[PDB]
A paper describes a structure:
We report the biochemical, structural, and functional characterization of the protein coded by gene [name] in the [name] PAO1 genome. Our structural work shows that the product of gene [name] is a protein that adopts the Dps subunit fold, which oligomerizes into a 12-mer quaternary structure. Unlike Dps, however, the ferroxidase di-iron centers and iron coordinating ligands are buried within each subunit, in a manner identical to that observed in the ferroxidase center of [name] bacterioferritin. The ferroxidase centers in Pa DpsL catalyze the oxidation of Fe2+ utilizing O2 or H2O2 as oxidant, and the resultant Fe3+ is compartmentalized in the interior cavity.
Fractions containing 12-mer were concentrated in 50 mM phosphate buffer pH 6.2 for crystallization screens. Prismatic crystals were obtained from the Proplex screen condition D5 (8% (w/v) PEG 6,000, 100 mM MES pH 6.0, 100 mM MgCl2). The N-terminal residues Met1 to Ser30 could not be modeled due to conformational disorder. The anomalous scattering difference map revealed the presence of two large electron density peaks (36.7 σ and 34.6 σ), which were assigned as Fe ions based on the electron density maps and coordination distances. The structure of the dinuclear center, which is contained within the four-helix bundle, is different from the typical architecture of dinuclear iron centers in Dps, but nearly identical to the ferroxidase center of [name] bacterioferritin (BfrB). Taken together, the structural features of Pa DpsL, which revealed a classic Dps fold harboring a bacterioferritin-type ferroxidase center, indicate that the product of gene [name] is a [name] (Pa DpsL).
Numbering used by the authors:
A (entry chain A), B (entry chain A): 31 to 177
Amino acid sequence: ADRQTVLRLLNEALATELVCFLRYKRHYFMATGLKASIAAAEFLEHANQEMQHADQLAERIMQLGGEPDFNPRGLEERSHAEYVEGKTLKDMVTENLIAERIAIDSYREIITYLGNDDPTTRRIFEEILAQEEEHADDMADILDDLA
Amino acid sequence: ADRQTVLRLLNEALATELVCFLRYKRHYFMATGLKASIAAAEFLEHANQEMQHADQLAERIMQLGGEPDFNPRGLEERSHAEYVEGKTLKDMVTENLIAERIAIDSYREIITYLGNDDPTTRRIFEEILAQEEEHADDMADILDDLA
Ligand SMILES: [Fe+2]
Ligand SMILES: [Fe+2]
Ligand SMILES: [Fe+2]
Ligand SMILES: [Fe+2]
């Protein structure tokens, strides 16, 4: 694989995970204000899992001799997912489902781009992808009870 | 106290803690690349403590009927501390000491501004201030062994 291209894709994924962490933290706090207990619990669980994903990505960046970009200024422009506050609980759940589906689609594209060229990095994306699918299922379950 | 002014100061402190979290996470990963084990450990411990501070601040914002601003785009402009990468270990340690001293000075100013007008919020800042003093001592201890 091209080392620089893999490092850029890892840093884009890192930005995605950090944006999703911040968005889920926002939603957790707002959900506590609505007394939406299980939604809040899922938002916080998901936030901490996104930070675990960020950690795995940054560790791989270090292993490949790159530098992980945690600068908040450019995060949104490196991330495929958006930071969106929303107003209602339904808005927040919908925005998280949108973001998880974006992350899923982006990680599938990265896995295909990598092919057989960097198996270690590929497996990291495969593991994260599987957990984003669980995140999306979690959000869909809540969203269906709000429709 | 003026509720809106207290909410703004809480959101500025929240941004400060989030910037410091991101900067310490950057430094942790770079320090692992340098095999600077105890510096890395302190950077990560400090990062997770800054996120605990952020959580306490956001919880108080919710209690006062405000909204905690986790948007990464404007974080640096709301934060008194800066996100600074540095190049060497000494640079990173120095930047964290600078940032802790900034946070300490800003939190002392906030505590004086609050006076007796919002004791709950004041005590939150007092608790965080005490831990930032410990963070600064930790960084100074490392920095002196690098001088
Ligand atoms: Fe993730
Ligand atoms: Fe996710
Ligand atoms: Fe702090
Ligand atoms: Fe600190």
